Amino acid sequence: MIIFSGGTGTPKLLDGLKEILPEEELTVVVNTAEDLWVSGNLISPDLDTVLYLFSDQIDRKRWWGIENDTFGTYERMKELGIEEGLKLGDRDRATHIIRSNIIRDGASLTDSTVKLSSLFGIKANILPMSDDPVSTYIETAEGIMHFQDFWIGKRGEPDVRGVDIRGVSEASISPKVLEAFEKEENILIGPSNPITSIGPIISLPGMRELLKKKKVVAVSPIIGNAPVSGPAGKLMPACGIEVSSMGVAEYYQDFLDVFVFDERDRADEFAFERLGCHASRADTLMTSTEKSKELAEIVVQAFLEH
Amino acid sequence: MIIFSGGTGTPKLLDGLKEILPEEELTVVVNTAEDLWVSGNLISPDLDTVLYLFSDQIDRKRWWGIENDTFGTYERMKELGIEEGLKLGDRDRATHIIRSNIIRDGASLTDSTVKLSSLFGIKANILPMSDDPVSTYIETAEGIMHFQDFWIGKRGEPDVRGVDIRGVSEASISPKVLEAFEKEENILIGPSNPITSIGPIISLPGMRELLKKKKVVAVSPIIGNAPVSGPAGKLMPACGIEVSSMGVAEYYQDFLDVFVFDERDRADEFAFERLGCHASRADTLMTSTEKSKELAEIVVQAFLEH
């Protein structure tokens, strides 16, 4: 199975999915539009969260970075009054370095990910959406900046007026992802930000037509009129998208077969049918692995049913 | 006073010199032929050792790196079986990052040294010999490799048959070093390897002729027929130079004015006179700060006696 992952939502679901399906059969296509070179090394946050999740080292408190990691370099630089831009732990930096040394030798982002997977003892097939650079810029009132500066540097406080994913049009779907699509038929879109987390992946050239030829299931990241977390509350409207389960559904309308939204919503299931997709409800608020596992089972059943 | 520094000998002597002269008056011109980009960031080992020595953070046990530094990142990669090429501490890596972010922004190695000096609160004037890239390669029976590969990777075991300082002829003396020379009259060559620690500096185009117009004092790094530490024993003969204080003096013959070698030698003062330089002996074996101080005093006396 192929899972489109980005943000913190999907990795939480993958946390449960990896408990009901053989790891080898799990192919995670990760968003790279957040990738940034920092302190000489490439940081692929969405790629690393999945790598750490599948290697039991993810920090389940923030759902990014390594559990109880040290910050020697980060602290020393802070004493000198220098800010790396994000809290880079020492063990986490090793991943950036190992990945970047591979890239500096000529290998691709996919190559480094495959290697990191072996080093971490991961059986799942973790792959970046593309081997090409893609960056997400948020057009706010205070000017145009990178997603990082906006979400981390500004705590997402600024007001968003637009979103720009640069390079996506010029990018190419990873060769190994196209290979996976050649042997797969089920695609799961995790409950993440449709604009900045998932959008980049589906925005790649040839992806929309590729999804149309497959069974696609998606889980709503919104439980009502606002997402469980993330800057989805601002980024979505700024793109002319209603912040609701119905909005997300309409967004994937072109290729969505099955949709799964939260119980609390209790929305017109007949309305979803109008969009051309079968919808069902479940508890999408994953407060623990067990809750994630229960949502993963409902999702699997969604693929099995006809 | 200007001091040419490289290796571990000169910084040990600087440790004593900074105790008997005002630090603001010490300008250190540092070797950069050992500089390497490692794990995404530039490492200038000779520059850093001096930076750490003048900021009271040098590790006096190995005379490189920071005292009681942590190795979170280094250890993590070791567990994964990946070697960076040398033991990089977390605090030390901060220095490489701060320096590299500056170079990445478009500034020079000298510019980054000025900034790091401010951050560290150093009064001494630390300058790299040149802003241009220079790399020391060691020609062995097993093949040609970088100094680091030979000294750290192979532990200095290979049989040395040649030394190649690449880029030195294309490199230029740092403009700030030329400016410092314009105002200085006394130049000191610390007791370091004359081939790879001092050699690169005096090999820069125009440097030799520049040294002739000044009062130069050198301290022999050889006691007897071998150096106190380092691979000078292999590198010197591999360049047709006899491993002795006399060999060192002949190497600097073109500009040496005063030579200081160890007492354990008792060599013909007529021999040195023939080379055109006043010579005297002293205990050049610096086993402690006090011994370095004692040797630094004799060195200052050498400049005073003229």
From Swiss-Prot, chains A, B:
Reaction(s) the record says it catalyses: (2S)-lactyl-2-diphospho-5'-guanosine + 7,8-didemethyl-8-hydroxy-5-deazariboflavin = oxidized coenzyme F420-0 + GMP + H(+)
UniProt key word Transferase: yes
Pfam families assigned: CofD (PF01933)
Enzyme Commission number: 2.7.8.28
Alphabetical list of InterPro entries matching this protein: CofD, CofD-like_dom_sf, FbiA/CofD
Binding site for 7,8-didemethyl-8-hydroxy-5-deazariboflavin: 48, 87
Keyword set includes RNA-binding: no
Single Gene Ontology BP annotation: F420-0 metabolic process
Enzyme category, top tier: transferase
Gene3D superfamilies, per the entry: CofD-like domain, CofD-like domains
Pathway of action: Cofactor biosynthesis; coenzyme F420 biosynthesis
Cofactor field: Mg(2+)
UniProt GO molecular function: LPPG:FO 2-phospho-L-lactate transferase activity; magnesium ion binding
Coiled coil: none
Function: Catalyzes the transfer of the 2-phospholactate moiety from (2S)-lactyl-2-diphospho-5'-guanosine to 7,8-didemethyl-8-hydroxy-5-deazariboflavin (FO) with the formation of oxidized coenzyme F420-0 and GMP.
Summary of subunit composition and partner proteins: Homodimer.
HAMAP family: CofD
Protein name: 2-phospho-L-lactate transferase
Organism: Methanosarcina mazei (strain ATCC BAA-159 / DSM 3647 / Goe1 / Go1 / JCM 11833 / OCM 88)
